[PDB]
Design a protein around this nucleic acid. Structure first.
Ligand SMILES: [Mg+2]
Ligand SMILES: [Zn+2]
Ligand SMILES: [Zn+2]
Lengths: 266, 133, 30, 114, 56, 15, 65, 391, 230, 43, 147
RNA sequence: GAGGA
């Protein structure tokens, strides 16, 4: 509005493409980076491999478990473990998953994320169902079982952010761009014969008029109007991803403000 | 303080010597046949062709960590399309009546000829170069 | 044709004929 | 085994209050501020915001060493304008812009069908 | 040549090095665990006795 | 150009 | 061994696409360029992750115990 | 350790992450690179031991080496390459980035130098912001080659205060050269100032480079078409001259210069022709490169590479040689079974012609392998020798 | 290969022709006509260093002896056929390389010492060394987590089973001076990408021990010790 | 491992050189540079 | 180490955002300094990176065999056809600021093999531990607490 | 044996 304008070019199940205009480059980039990094969510964090006989080392498996996106829409109702006083986890700060698999078949028995089963009480919070983008309905391929191999373990999922460990990222690489015509001359084109031909012009070049070469380089101009595309890993609806990124950034700034209040306090 | 020197110049020639935004200007004082001038320009910010025509004076006024042009009180010799600032570094004397002064503008260089430019262009890191059309 | 000459590409077939009846440690075993 | 635990890339320590003001000496009406558990995310943002201000004479920041989640920030205002005030105003402006953006995007998001 | 003109000594350490452009020319970034091991014997004077007490 | 593993079909189809 | 989840750089989940990828190859005879593009792996940070995987866990699964 | 310089004293900064980390300019004395090298650290145990260290063996004391009475340290690759670019005449820096750069200098007094341009957009040249790092008083005037107080080529170097006036900073000024800046600053303000100088220059330039970026890639080595076929025909001329000499020799008309065999005379002539050819092509390639070509920049700045590397990566790898004389008839009267006998044509005896870009034909490849192994052997022997000699 | 004349020394020729290739491919895909057969029909021939002294090999089958007959400038400068009385043609030149060298992509564009260094290093790379590692019990095993076959391969790597037991991963590398933290070699690695699992690896170490070697009554025993005058 | 199984040694004339006759028989590249450079060879 | 000659060790790790990122949102996982190249002249390194980029785009296998007829020109043509700068350069964006970089970046996949000797087997420090028998100097070998 | 550099 008075600040930024957003014009969504396109929205999907997993992507929004939108123009971010009437903003400053720094704000955009910070938004970019917070969405990548600082917006919290839920992920497996500790595995009690009660038994395993597969051909995979446990910590290998536990690692893969960490990476499995989980339903984390209302993560906010959950508490960081370092805040819950309970002895290391409870239902206010954790969700317990479990897993049993056994190679009953003669052929290979796959073990999919969907085989995970919630045990802890959700208290009616839309949390923790492993995300299943797969059309066939079974999520990530966790492990394979031959015949007698049995895998049986329980996991704990916890609120965390991508700074601690990438598994918490709803990230799913974000696109970003501005001045597709290089009118700002923020970059200079390496070239053998002609910068014009040798550089494939971006798809966004249409949304802005080509530079008229008969114009002096405008130095007054500054970079606004950023073309961004956010892909979501799925643990959070895309729109929710960008909204929460905005909100998180705002929260941390407000925190700075509060710290100033404490300083002026005493 | 004021104009330490003023004049106008017919740009004889302009060369983009291996640079993108900087060209070396060759101009002669229309007035003092023995006054001439070589100068580099950020032509990107201030395009120039041959026989062109420019912004004037060797000012000295309009220490003191440079402050942003807080455009409440911005009233300098802010009357030109080009204002550079820089330092004299040699006063080589071409002939008995021909003194040349060498100014450096952050690496942009400049040189002047005559003798009526007499010792008012003295060794002064201060100088705000301009000379007119 | 079948008596036709050989393009440099073909040689890889020949190579694979080798290494099928030789292995890579042929000499040790032999 | 000499790796620092990664949670302290965002966790204030003990006496590591988020801020630590320090009056600069080199120039008048200037200050140097240290943020713990931060990085360019917040820095570059606030910095540009300050730069927007008219009464700010100088504003820059730096992350001294990437092993550490700090960054110093140095402000310098014209006279009669306390630095911490300029900081407050920058934060407020940023927050308002963010709030606007939030509502506006939420709007345009409702503008979709998927 | 092996035990007199040169020997093997205590109070030393060895590791891979890595450049760093945020270190003063004469500095060196000894990793913490090493510093947890090498020591230097101070002498208790009135100048440090408090500080040394804190250390111990 | 690249290394092609579809030549198994080529001979199998050509045979 | 088994497919990795989450293309290393990009982060996108890929641990589920493996089965479908193989299917496309066998049953649809498809060309893996188009196969990848079918699964949606647009940028090569993920295309690499799938295309070049090697599924040793098969050959592990053949030791009886 | 072949140096007093190989052991120096340092101040300890305790950090995480098990490697030893150390500033970058200090690599050349230790002659180390971070490709997995390791270094040992010794802890003095007593008061005068550490006094000895900090007063005799501290690094800044060692900046000027008695070995050649020129400084033994200097600015190096990334910084060296950047600082040239930053200090080109074309560079200009907008305000905000200027402010950040300043703040990076630890000793910046807190004064914002007046921008070199106040025309309506305040712009600072690079040289100014660099000069903020240089302590006041230095002079260092050089007049490199054709400099004329207007340095149209911007070469030379001239600083008339702790503030630089014209000239592009590069190896000859800020490297480890003789009359270089490091020299001067040592002699003037003592080691502490010089070390602080290293620190300041590094920080500023690294920041700027980081935000300006710099990379190189395959396209850097590609020469222009016309240039390419010109190279080719140059090589062809060389071949022709060799052939003419050969025909004459086999007509027994070659006149052996005194003091050497007819055969030796011929062989030398051929080798000379071939080397002249390689270099002719090298100059062609080098000349053709535009200034944005990153390799040309790493050369101009002198931080890496040399003309010969350009020549080999783009024009012609040129003659291979084992023990100075070119490739010898290992087989009876021919270097490789792929040849007839008694062929003295340049490629029969090892004149690699394609560039490293075009790749080597299998002969050339093999010949080059022979040459390279000779290189490896010589290096291995030479270090053991020089080690024993030095002992 | 064994060069020969045909209707003409023109049109001189490898004895082996596309028919034999077809038969070979057929045997290959049958999964009847094996390399030994090539031997017996005398299309291929074993040559040692001594005999090499008296032959005249051609490098590439076709171009070296089609006949005496516009060129892509990027292509290297091949010499010519230039001769007629060949007697053999190399099978494929890339076979002069040994095992380790065959891993290198485009080794014909590198400076030879580099090739040698790689040949040496390649024996350090982590990777799966055997498919049954979890059954072997030996000292010091290193296994990569998620190997990947290279994108740029060489034909020979097929015969080394390399693309089934690869020894590295394909990183998205970027050549740049980013923050000077990567100069004077190496480099910066994406931390998050590591968390995703990049270049992880398993390490296995085996400790061996047995009961007494010697002593009729000196008989070392395995058990949990205590303060039993221990 | 594979490389190991095809290695080759020479005890103790320029034996460290790469002679032409090695063409096609010994890898022109692979050799443990060091003291043994040129002695140890591979097929 | 790459597959040519470039030994190297890590020497800092950045989180994802801090790395430069291109407009498509790709972010390298390995940044090596350009100064490595010219001195060593490992052209094949660059060529492999280019070729592999093309392969990954098009879903193929990079035929890097030595003495073939593949040229750089062909690879580049393909790469252009997939819609990238025909030499692998890419406009990239600084991670900290989000601003474009003035110089474009060579960028592509490339096969890298992790060598042994992690540091944890080299780190080593002695502060008066055990000594030999014969000469009563410090014992040797880091495994044996040597000096 | 190993071996990095
Ligand atoms: Mg080294
Ligand atoms: Zn709890
Ligand atoms: Zn990806």
């Amino acid at each position: 509005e008075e600040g930024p304008q957003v014009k969504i070019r396109e929205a999907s199940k997993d992507n929004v493409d939108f123009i971010l205009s009437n903003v400053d480059l720094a704000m955009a980039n910070s938004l970019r980076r917070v969405m990548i990094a600082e917006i919290p969510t839920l992920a497996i964090d500790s595995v009690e491999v009660e038994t395993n006989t597969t051909v995979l080392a446990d910590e290998f498996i536990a690692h893969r478990l960490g990476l499995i996106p989980l339903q984390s829409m209302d993560i906010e109702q959950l508490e960081y473990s370092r805040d819950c006083f309970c002895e290391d986890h409870c239902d206010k700060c954790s969700v317990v998953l479990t897993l049993q698999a056994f190679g009953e078949s003669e052929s290979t028995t796959n073990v999919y994320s969907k085989d995970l089963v919630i045990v802890s009480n959700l208290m009616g919070r839309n949390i923790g169902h492993p995300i299943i983008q797969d059309k066939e309905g079974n999520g990530v391929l966790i492990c394979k079982l031959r015949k007698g191999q049995e895998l049986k373990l329980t996991c704990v999922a916890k609120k965390g952010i991508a700074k601690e460990h990438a598994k918490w990222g709803p990230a799913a690489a974000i696109e970003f761009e501005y001045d597709p015509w290089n009118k700002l001359k923020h970059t200079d084109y390496w070239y053998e014969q002609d910068s014009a031909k040798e550089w494939p012009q971006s798809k966004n070049c249409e949304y802005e008029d080509p530079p008229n070469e008969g114009d002096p380089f405008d130095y007054k101009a500054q970079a606004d109007t950023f073309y961004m595309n956010v892909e979501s890993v799925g643990s959070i609806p895309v729109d929710q991803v960008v909204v929460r990124g905005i909100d998180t950034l705002q929260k941390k700034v407000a925190s700075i403000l509060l710290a100033l209040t404490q300083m002026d306090q005493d | 303080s004021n104009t330490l020197f003023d004049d106008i110049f017919q740009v004889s020639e302009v060369d983009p010597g291996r640079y993108n935004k900087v060209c070396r200007i060759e101009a002669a004082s229309t007035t003092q046949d023995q006054c001439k001038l070589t100068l580099d320009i950020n032509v990107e910010l201030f395009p120039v062709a041959a026989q062109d025509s420019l912004t004037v004076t060797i000012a000295s006024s309009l220490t003191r960590s440079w402050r942003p042009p807080q455009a409440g009180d911005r009233s300098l010799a802010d009357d030109y399309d080009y204002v550079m600032y820089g330092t004299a570094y040699k006063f080589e004397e071409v002939s008995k009546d021909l003194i040349a002064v060498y100014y450096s503008f952050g690496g942009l260089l400049m040189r002047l000829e005559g003798n009526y430019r007499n010792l008012n262009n003295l060794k002064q890191e201060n100088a705000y170069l301009l000379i007119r059309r | 044709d079948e008596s036709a000459p050989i393009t440099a590409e073909d040689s890889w077939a020949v190579i694979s004929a080798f290494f099928r009846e030789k292995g890579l440690v042929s000499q040790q075993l032999d | 085994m000499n790796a620092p635990d990664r949670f302290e890339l965002f966790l204030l320590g003990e006496g590591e209050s988020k801020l630590k003001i320090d009056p600069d000496t080199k120039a008048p009406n200037a200050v140097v501020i240290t943020f713990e558990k931060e990085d360019h995310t917040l820095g570059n943002l606030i910095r540009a915001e300050l730069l927007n201000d008219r009464k700010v004479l100088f504003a820059a920041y730096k992350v001294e060493h990437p092993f550490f989640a700090r960054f110093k920030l140095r402000i310098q205002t014209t006279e009669g304008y306390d630095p911490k005030d300029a900081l407050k105003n920058a934060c407020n402006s940023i927050i308002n812009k963010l709030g606007a953006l939030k509502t506006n995007f939420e709007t345009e998001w409702n503008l979709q069908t998927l | 040549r092996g035990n007199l003109m040169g020997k093997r000594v205590d109070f030393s350490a060895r590791t891979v090095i890595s450049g760093d452009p945020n270190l003063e020319l004469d500095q060196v970034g000894v990793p913490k665990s090493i510093a947890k091991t090498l020591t230097y014997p101070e002498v208790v004077t009135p100048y440090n006795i408090d500080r040394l007490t804190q250390l111990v | 150009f690249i290394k092609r593993d579809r030549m198994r079909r080529n001979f199998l189809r050509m045979r | 061994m088994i497919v990795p989840v989450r293309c290393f750089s990009c982060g996108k989940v890929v641990g589920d696409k493996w089965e479908s990828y193989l299917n496309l190859l066998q049953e649809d005879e498809l060309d893996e360029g188009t196969a990848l593009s079918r699964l949606g792996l647009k940028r090569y940070c993920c295309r690499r992750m799938i295309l070049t995987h090697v599924d040793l866990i098969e050959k592990f699964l053949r030791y009886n115990p | 350790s072949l140096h007093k310089m190989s052991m120096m004293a340092h101040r300890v900064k305790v950090i995480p992450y098990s490697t030893f980390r150390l500033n970058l300019s200090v690599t050349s004395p230790y002659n180390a690179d971070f490709d997995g090298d390791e270094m040992n650290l010794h802890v003095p145990q007593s008061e005068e031991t550490r006094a000895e260290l900090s007063q005799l063996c501290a690094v800044p004391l060692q900046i000027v080496s008695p070995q050649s009475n020129k400084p033994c340290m200097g600015i190096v690759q990334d910084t060296l390459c950047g600082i040239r670019k930053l200090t080109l005449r074309d560079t200009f820096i907008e305000l905000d980035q200027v402010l950040n750069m300043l703040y990076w200098v630890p000793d910046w007094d807190g004064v914002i130098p007046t921008p070199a341009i106040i025309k309506p957009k305040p712009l600072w040249s690079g040289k100014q912001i660099l000069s903020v790092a240089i302590p006041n008083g230095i002079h260092l005037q050089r007049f490199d080659e054709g400099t004329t107080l207007l340095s149209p080529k911007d070469n030379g170097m001239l600083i008339i205060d702790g503030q630089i006036i014209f000239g592009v900073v590069e190896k000859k000024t800020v490297g480890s050269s003789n009359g270089g800046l490091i020299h001067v600053v040592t002699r003037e303000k003592g080691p502490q100032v010089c070390a602080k100088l290293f620190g300041n220059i590094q920080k500023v330039v690294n920041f700027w480079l980081l935000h300006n970026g710099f990379s190189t890639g395959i396209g850097d080595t590609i020469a222009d078409g016309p240039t390419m076929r010109e190279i080719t025909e140059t090589i062809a001329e060389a071949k022709k001259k060799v052939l003419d000499v050969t025909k004459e020799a086999q007509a027994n008309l070659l006149t052996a210069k005194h003091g050497m065999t007819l055969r030796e005379s011929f062989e030398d002539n051929v080798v000379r022709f071939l080397n002249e050819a390689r270099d002719k092509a090298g100059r062609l390639a080098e000349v053709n490169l535009k200034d944005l070509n990153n390799v040309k920049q790493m050369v101009m700045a002198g931080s890496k590479g040399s003309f010969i590397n350009i020549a080999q990566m783009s024009a012609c790898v040129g003659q291979q040689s084992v023990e100075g004389k070119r490739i010898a008839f290992g087989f009876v009267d021919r270097t490789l079974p792929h040849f007839s006998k008694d062929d003295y044509s340049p490629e029969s005896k090892g004149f690699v012609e394609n560039s490293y870009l075009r790749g080597l034909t299998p002969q050339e490849f093999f010949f080059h392998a022979m040459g390279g192994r000779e290189g490896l052997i010589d290096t291995a022997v030479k270090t053991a020798e020089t080690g024993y000699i030095q002992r | 290969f064994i060069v020969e004349d045909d209707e003409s020394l023109g049109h001189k020729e490898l004895k082996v022709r596309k028919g034999h290739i077809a038969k070979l491919m057929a045997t290959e895909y049958q999964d009847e006509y094996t390399w030994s057969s090539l031997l017996n029909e005398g299309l291929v021939e074993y040559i040692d260093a001594e005999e090499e002294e008296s032959i005249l090999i051609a490098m590439q089958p076709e171009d070296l002896e089609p006949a005496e007959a516009d060129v892509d400038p990027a292509k290297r400068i091949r010499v010519s056929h230039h001769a007629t009385t060949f007697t053999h043609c190399e099978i494929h030149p890339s076979m002069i390389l040994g095992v380790a060298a065959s891993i290198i992509p485009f080794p014909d564009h590198n400076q030879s010492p580099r090739n040698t260094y790689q040949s040496a290093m390649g024996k350090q790379a982590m990777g799966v060394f055997l498919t049954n590692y979890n059954v072997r019990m030996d000292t010091m095993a290193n296994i990569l987590y998620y190997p990947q076959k290279p994108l740029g391969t060489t034909r020979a790597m097929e015969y080394l089973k390399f693309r089934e037991l690869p020894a590295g991963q394909n990183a998205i590398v970027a050549i740049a001076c980013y923050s000077g933290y990567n100069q004077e070699d190496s480099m910066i690695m994406n931390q998050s990408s590591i968390d995703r699992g990049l270049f992880r690896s398993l390490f296995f170490r085996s400790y061996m021990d047995q009961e007494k070697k010697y002593g009729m009554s000196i008989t070392e025993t395995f058990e949990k010790p205590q303060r039993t005058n221990t | 491992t594979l490389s190991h199984l095809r290695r080759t040694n020479t005890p103790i004339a320029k034996p460290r050189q790469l002679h032409n006759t090695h063409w096609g028989l010994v890898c022109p590249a692979e050799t443990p540079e060091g003291q043994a450079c040129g002695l140890v060879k591979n097929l | 180490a790459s597959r040519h000659g470039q030994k190297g060790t890590i020497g800092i790790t950045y989180r994802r955002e801090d790395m430069p990122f291109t407009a498509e949102g790709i972010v390298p996982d390995l940044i090596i300094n350009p100064h490595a190249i010219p001195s060593r002249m490992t052209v094949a390194h660059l060529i492999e990176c280019l070729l592999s980029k093309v392969a990954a785009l098009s879903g193929n296998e990079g035929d890097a065999s030595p003495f073939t007829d593949i040229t750089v020109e062909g690879i580049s043509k393909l790469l252009r056809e997939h819609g990238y700068q025909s030499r692998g350069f890419e406009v990239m964006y600084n991670g900290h600021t989000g601003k474009k970089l003035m110089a474009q970046i060579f960028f592509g996949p490339t096969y890298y093999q992790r060598l042994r000797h992690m540091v944890d087997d080299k780190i080593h420090a002695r502060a008066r531990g055990p000594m030999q028998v014969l000469t009563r100097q410090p014992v040797e070998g880091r495994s044996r607490d040597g000096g």
